[PDB]
Ligand binder design. Structure first.
Ligand SMILES: Nc1ncnc2c1ncn2[C@@H]1O[C@H](COP(=O)(O)OP(=O)(O)O)[C@@H](O)[C@H]1O
Ligand SMILES: Nc1ncnc2c1ncn2[C@@H]1O[C@H](COP(=O)(O)OP(=O)(O)O)[C@@H](O)[C@H]1O
Ligand SMILES: Nc1ncnc2c1ncn2[C@@H]1O[C@H](COP(=O)(O)OP(=O)(O)O)[C@@H](O)[C@H]1O
Ligand SMILES: [Mg+2]
Lengths: 513, 513
């Protein structure tokens, strides 16, 4: 009979995408719509919630139209999954169905003042004071502090709060709310874990933290798993309820990085995913028992398939400048013109030969949180060329991830089994070879470019019966979607010497204000 | 009354050049002939003395032939001045009139083993043991150690020493010897001050230093001033005498850096010159009393006009990578296509916005000696561009000079009156402006920049009576050749910030070994 299709909304920081998958886990139809990156002040970033909603709607109707062209028997989508940029918080009124203000992005720094105040007055100076509850440090990124800011600075948000019509929610909630025409007010365990308001292990809202951070629990949605019935697409914007035909259940919701972990089949303990973009996030599945960090890392939910399915937890490490570093060498420094020359020049030299380039342009994150760190090159002679500098940048990305991986291994008591990588820099062959040799792990690069989107589609498809088990999911994946493997090709001393050289260079990165 | 002309032989590390000046101090003819750069062993550099002499004669006959084509008033050259690469030492036989080997160049490093031996055995671990006598530390550069190497390693030189036919001479002596047809064996006070054999206070050879270093006084020439009769040109090697037509006296001899000091009219104490070339050589007139450094700067003779005349001393400082940095950014780093873009890109930004680039590619010299220092960049953000790196390099050159100048001012017990500039990077308007703001003195840019050649021509012309006083020399210069004056135009906090950043960066430069 006809193919079963699963649709995935991939709502990213810069754009929204709807991707329709079939039973082969193959992306058969795609549409993308970008949205506005509002920066009203320095360090501020916010998105127009209604623009994001309309973008998703357009993506759906266009992708549906394109598929019916390829398959005329395509009448319905079995279920829809959502995957989203995390932490970004929307504030809306439950009567007008409208947002009270623009949504502060995960990246936004406006919450700095509140962040300081929380650590000092509630944490007594310790930013890790609630880390055994949330798995998180006090930071500008997490949803709670953005909520507090909107209560303190936006009169309309406080007006909705004082009346009792205020709703707070991350992008998954907002989308599910508007897609349902105001009928659903829900969130998944992964998104909820990024709010600073959820107990990580019990996966329930914490009244202790909600009251301390002055957030009314009346403004918070219901927490569900990643794979179950969330609601139904009940909106004719932009003709989506029509474009859909059979009434379509929303059955998947999962944070973007977690969706990548899931979509790359990282089901076992020690299986990890590094998602490349401007920076990169590294997530490792640490098993069913939550692991807490002594070395800067985040403790988060990996995935939970079903209301009482096993919850797999993860450790998370972020480094800020990856793809941005390679482009920096291009648009800012003129080291190359085409991004194909980047690897060509880097491979044209036997080594860095004395130099180390620490591309800490936005400070040191990884495990060693040092906001004073800056971009720095040491050890240069007159024999130093752009080729050695580019290769040093590639070595640096590898060494930075090694610092994260090392920290993850110690925090989890678990070796990195294998590493999946996708995104802009996963194409760079030399970077992969250096990373594989330095980490001592196999690097798997998916030939299918839509593994982030696939995660939410897998969550929905499992809930909708398109796929019946993770073992079937894995079997279909192996049959349909190939991958390149990059194995270690370096020596033991070659690694130790490179790290020792790296450690010496880090000492000189401090620059500060 | 007829037009008067003075010739200048400029014998450098890479080429020889004859420049004819008229009485207006205008360069009216020039020809350049290179000589072979012999590098038999790594770090070694050697010059064929007969090739250098042949080149000098070739340069003279061609430049003269060129002049009479375009100048009907040119009849003869009144006098010839010589200016030469210092320290480079020639060993020749007094009977064959030919060298026994090639001449080790000033930057040649074959004398390292001997230089460590002198510091150990004669100095007692102190390389400054004869600094109060010579003004120099024990170093590979200076002639005495090259002479010693020739007696230890070259059998012909050791053999000539036995018979009493061996002559040691710096380039001024070798040329003066061969030009005269073996009739003159003399050196000027500036060139002699670079042998490690002259006493600064007496301006004579030190019997004790000759005794200690086993260099017989039979091998050394007679020390004279920079301006007087040395001899006559009595050779027709490349048709030179014929070109000269009339008999021509050699009336000027001065080391290349001192010649720039003289060419730039630094006749008064407090007046300084800097040659912005591949590296920087800073010379400051310290007066009629020798001033000694505690910052590793060299004490030397600046000039002496006339037999036993007033002897003005100098302090000398150098930086390794000035022009070499600008070129390095172009070829090795692709920061710009060719020379003109360096200034334009650097000017396009108001400042360096936090970054510091310390181009210590071959260590730090000046008042902070550190061979372990390497090329370093600190403070980079994603806002940093190639333009910022270029401007930072220019700032770094100026900052290094500021440190050298400061150290000179303290030891000499005098303020910097003004800085005259030449070399090539003096054409960079922004570099001059930054330099002026950092120093707090006006910077003088001669529109006639053949200043090194001018010094020897002035020396010869003063002895020949073409110019009758230093006061008239300046008057002619002021009337005929226009100066560009660059006044300090910075902010107290901007200079304060630039120096403070520079200071921090220097601490992060240690790397080598
Ligand atoms: N082996 C297959 N079995 C069933 N349907 C398929 C198969 N291959 C392609 N299709 C269908 O053909 C349409 C076009 O997809 P296409 O771009 O060819 O997919 P792919 O490139 O992944 O094979 C889609 O609707 C897809 O479901
Ligand atoms: N139910 C199925 N749907 C699609 N392909 C299947 C199925 N069962 C087995 N296969 C096999 O999986 C392989 C992948 O097919 P397909 O995705 O069409 O390849 P392509 O990359 O050319 O699109 C084929 O060799 C096919 O025989
Ligand atoms: N001390 C110096 N004086 C003048 N130019 C120098 C010096 N050192 C390096 N240079 C560079 O060499 C070029 C010409 O100098 P030149 O006198 O021909 O060198 P050399 O002394 O080796 O013959 C200039 O463009 C300049 O950048
Ligand atoms: Mg196909």
């Amino acid at each position: 009979f006809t193919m079963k299709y699963v649709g995935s909304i991939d709502q990213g920081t810069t754009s929204t995408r709807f991707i329709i998958f079939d039973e082969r886990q193959r992306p058969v139809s795609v549409h993308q719509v970008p949205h506005t990156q509002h920066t009203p002040h320095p360090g501020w970033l916010e998105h127009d919630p209604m623009e994001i909603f309309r973008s998703a709607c357009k993506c759906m109707s266009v992708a549906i139209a394109k598929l019916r062209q390829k398959d005329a028997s395509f009448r319905k989508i079995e279920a829809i999954g959502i995957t989203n940029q995390r932490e970004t918080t929307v504030a809306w009124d439950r009567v007008t169905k409208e947002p009270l203000c623009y949504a502060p992005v995960w990246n936004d720094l406006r919450t700095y003042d509140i962040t300081k105040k929380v650590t000092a007055e509630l944490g007594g100076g310790d930013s890790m004071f609630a880390s055994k509850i949330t798995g998180l440090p006090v930071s500008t990124y997490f949803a709670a502090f953005k909520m507090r800011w909107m209560l303190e600075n936006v009169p309309a948000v406080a007006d909705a709060c004082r009346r009792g019509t205020l709703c707070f929610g991350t992008i998954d909630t907002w989308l599910m709310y508007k897609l349902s025409g105001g009928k659903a007010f829900v969130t998944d365990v992964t998104n909820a874990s990024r709010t600073f308001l959820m107990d990580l292990r019990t996966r329930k809202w914490s009244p202790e933290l909600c009251e301390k951070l002055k957030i009314p629990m009346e403004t918070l949605p219901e927490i569900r798993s990643n794979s179950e019935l969330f609601g139904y697409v009940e909106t004719d914007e932009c003709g989506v309820a029509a474009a859909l035909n059979e009434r379509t259940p929303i059955m998947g919701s999962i944070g973007d990085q977690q969706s990548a972990l899931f979509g790359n089949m990282c089901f076992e303990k020690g299986e990890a995913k590094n998602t490349y973009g401007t920076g990169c996030f590294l997530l490792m599945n640490v098993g069913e028992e939550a692991r807490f960090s002594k070395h800067g890392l985040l403790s988060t939910v990996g995935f939970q398939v079903g209301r009482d399915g096993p919850c797999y937890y993860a450790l998370e490490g972020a480094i800020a400048c990856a793809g941005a570093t390679v482009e920096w060498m291009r648009r800012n420094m003129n080291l190359f013109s085409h991004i194909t020359e980047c690897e060509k020049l880097a491979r044209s030299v036997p080594g860095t030969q004395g130099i180390v380039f620490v591309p800490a342009f936005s400070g040191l994150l990884a495990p060693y949180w040092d906001p004073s760190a800056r971009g720095t090159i040491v050890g240069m002679t007159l024999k130093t060329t752009r080729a050695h500098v580019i290769r040093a940048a590639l070595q640096a990305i590898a060494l930075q991830l090694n610092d994260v991986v090392g920290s993850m291994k110690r925090d989890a008591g678990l070796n990195l089994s294998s590493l999946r990588v996708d995104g802009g820099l996963s194409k760079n062959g030399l970077l992969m070879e250096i990373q594989a040799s330095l980490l001592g792990v196999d690097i798997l690069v998916p030939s299918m470019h839509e593994t982030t989107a696939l995660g939410a589609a897998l969550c929905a498809g499992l809930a909708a019966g398109v796929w019946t088990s993770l073992e079937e999911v894995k079997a279909v994946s192996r049959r349909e979607n190939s991958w390149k493997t990059v194995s270690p090709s370096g020596s033991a001393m070659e690694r130790e010497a490179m790290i020792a050289e790296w450690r010496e260079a880090l000492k000189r990165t401090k620059w500060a204000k």
